[model samples]
Target chain A: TERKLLERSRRLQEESKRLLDEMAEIMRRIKKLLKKARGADEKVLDELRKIIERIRELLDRSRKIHERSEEIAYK
Target chain B: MTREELLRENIELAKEHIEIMREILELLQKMEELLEKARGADEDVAKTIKELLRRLKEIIERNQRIAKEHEYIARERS
Candidate 1:
């Protein structure tokens, strides 16, 4: 039913948003850790920065999808 | 904290990120399936959902690559 589909869409959107927020929080923690790191830790910090960049790209795409999901749910 | 402790926490955070990515992928798949079933209601929305699914797949692949890099970093640390 349309009603059920709408409800499902909203739920998925909410869940996706929650997970994305968690991901962002984790990225923040990693960046904080990076600040205190030095010497040998620098190598892994470089890799962590790369990972953060990739996650940033993914977050952009995910936000677009989330917007689309909203249109489906409310439009 | 010591440098080792910092790196150890970094590895743990990376693992947590990968786990979250897996959950997001599953959610995206479910959304795709649901949109497919509702295609009759809105063809445009369904088509967009298909495209979004493709993007999500690419993101997941990137996440896997990051996981591998994280593993390599962890190994080098130990």
Candidate 2:
């Protein structure tokens, strides 16, 4: 039982690592977008929209991950 | 002791962990997105971003601990 738990836990940790890595990349991209935008509201709006959508995409992936975690089992 | 019951309870514990992860993910998404909408002296936004960055660091550190423990478990099991 412990072995099975360990194996499953490792797999789950791997998934988390992958998701976290992607989040780090997305954070970097958003940081870049912030640095480039100047005073005007409209100037940043377009890039801002793109970043929001990208983040939503990441959020959805995380939801799917939660779903997938439910499937790990011990036999 | 029923093996299935033990397994089921373990799964329940795992589900709680996933819920914790989801909660963290939700906060991160909200704050990171807010940084874009916030503007001014860039003062408020900078402060907000700094706070979120610190929070992000904490989460990353927690995640590292989780990963290390899992690695140890897996190695021990093998």
Candidate 3:
């Protein structure tokens, strides 16, 4: 039924949000590592920064998707 | 921990994050497919679901690339 699908969608949205949080934590750890590298590994540090930025964008998108899913499920 | 130890730990964390992202992507895909089969009359909701799936796909690919880059960094460090 339509209601069932909506419920499933909501569940998936919740799970995705949880996973995104974990991803954000990993990004934080990476940033800490990047800081420690400092001048020794400029190239690697730069790449880590870029990757963190990419993950940030992804986290934003996932949040939007979660919001949209909630709207769809509840509306 | 030393810098090298921290780097190795991060590599593992990055790999774990990638797996989480993949799981999320699969969940999104499953939800989309489920809705697709018994879609309601609401065209707008259907379109929104499709858009969500598309975004999830993009996120997964970007995360995979990030993991690869992390691996390369690990190699460079070692």
Candidate 4:
């Protein structure tokens, strides 16, 4: 046990960062989609709407995992 | 100990350091951006930026110490 830890904590961090990047990408896409005003091109809006729903799902799950990851990581 | 965890933590710390440096860069950038619009960009604005820059430098130095110590600690564990 002393020689090597029998735990895998890096996935915690990797998942954290991967989510962060995805979050940024989503936000950027949202900004781009919203930038077009007056009708806003329904196709873009439709895509964005689907993406935003998925983002919400990811965020909810990621939040819990992030906490768990950090909790286990620090120990 | 796992290099994975070490690498993860180090990446986090390094990213944080990068963020801090960017804040300083942004501060300077704002000064440059506002120079033309400052109208009367006097000692006041300059002094404020100077103070913030000094504080940021101090923080950078503190981070450097922590970083050096972290390397030693990592090596010891390794």
Give model 4's docking category. Answer: incorrect
Clashes of 2: 0
Q: lDDT of model 4 at residue A10?
A: 38
lDDT of 3 at A1: 55
The regions of model 3 sitting more than 4 angstroms off are: A1-19, A22-75, B1-40
lDDT of 1 by residue, B1-78 (tens): 666765665565556656667766765665555445444334544455566556666655655655565555556555
Q: lDDT ranking from best to worst?
A: 2, 3, 1, 4
Pull out the clashing pairs in model 4.
A5-B1
Estimate, for each residue in B23-73, the C-alpha lDDT of model 2 and write its tens digit.
Answer: 667756865665656555366546656776776787678778777877777
lDDT per residue for candidate 2 within A1-75, as digits (tens), equals: 786886779677787777688668758855865564444445556656776676677667666655655544423
Write down the DockQ of candidate 4. 0.01
Give the alpha carbon lDDT tens digit for every residue of A1-75 in model 3.
556555655565565566677666655654554454443345444555665566566677656655654554453
Candidate 3 — what's its lDDT? 0.56
Regions of candidate 4 where Cα sits further than 4 Å from its true position: A1-75, B1-40
- Which scores better on TM-score, 2 or 3? 2
Deviating ranges (above 4 Å) for candidate 2? A7-11, A14-22, A25-33, A36-75, B1-39
Worst lDDT run of 10 residues, candidate 1 chain A, spans A32-41
